[PDB]
Amino acid sequence: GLPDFTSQSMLQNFRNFILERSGILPATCCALPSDFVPIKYRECPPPLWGHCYLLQLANYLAYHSDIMRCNLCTPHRSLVCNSQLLSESQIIGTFELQGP
Amino acid sequence: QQAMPNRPNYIGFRDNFVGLMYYNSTGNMGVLAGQASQLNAVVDLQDRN
C-alpha cells in the first residue's frame, strides 16, 4: 500500500523544500527543479542517470495518462463508449421499491 | 351624478390546478402504508415545496 495519494499542494511544498535547501529563493520568480536535469542517458553524467530514468518514466506516464484517460477510461469506464453504463446512469435516481 | 363601469374580474382555476391537493400539510397528510404496517410511506412535510 506504499503508493499513496499526494495532493498538488503537498507536491508544491516539497518542490519549495528542494528549491530553498538548494540555495535558490522561491520568490525569485519561476523555478522548477525538473528544469535543471539532462534528458538522454548519453547527455548526462553517470551519477544522475537514475534521475534521467525517472524523468523519462515520468514523461512516459504523463503522456500515457492523457494528462499531456490512458486505458483506464476509454474501454469501459467511459459512458459515451459504454452504452450499458450510460443507460444505467440515466436511471440513477428514478428508483423506488416498497413492499411491506 | 356620474357613473363608471365595474372593473373586469376573471375567476377560474389555477395553473396546473395548484392548491387543490394538500401537499406539505403536516396537519392533513396521507399514508401509503400497508394494511398491517403502520409506517407512513408518504413523508409529507413542509421542508420541500
Curated annotation (Swiss-Prot), chain A:
It is found in: Host cytoplasm. Induction: Expressed in the late phase of the viral replicative cycle. It comes from the Viruses. Might be cleaved by the viral protease. Monomer. Interacts with hexon protein; this interaction allows chaperoning and trimerization of hexon proteins. Interacts (via N-terminus) with host initiation factor EIF4G (via C-terminus). Interacts (via RRM domain) with viral mRNAs that contain the tripartite leader; this interaction allows ribosome shunting and expression of viral late mRNAs. Belongs to the adenoviridae shutoff protein family. Protein that inhibits host translation while promoting late viral translation by ribosome shunting. Blocks host cap-dependent translation by binding to eIF4G, displacing MKNK1 from cap initiation complexes and preventing EIF4E phosphorylation. Binds to the tripartite leader sequence of viral late mRNAs and recruits host eIF4G, PABPC1/poly-A binding protein and 40S ribosomes subunits on viral mRNAs, allowing ribosome shunting and efficient translation of late viral mRNAs even though conventional translation via ribosome scanning from the cap has been shut off in the host cell. All late proteins expressed from the major late promoter are produced by alternative splicing and alternative polyadenylation of the same gene giving rise to non-overlapping ORFs. A leader sequence is present in the N-terminus of all these mRNAs and is recognized by the viral shutoff protein to provide expression although conventional translation via ribosome scanning from the cap has been shut off in the host cell. This is Shutoff protein. It comes from Human adenovirus C serotype 2 (HAdV-2). The gene is L4. The chain holds residues 487 to 599 of 805 of the full protein.
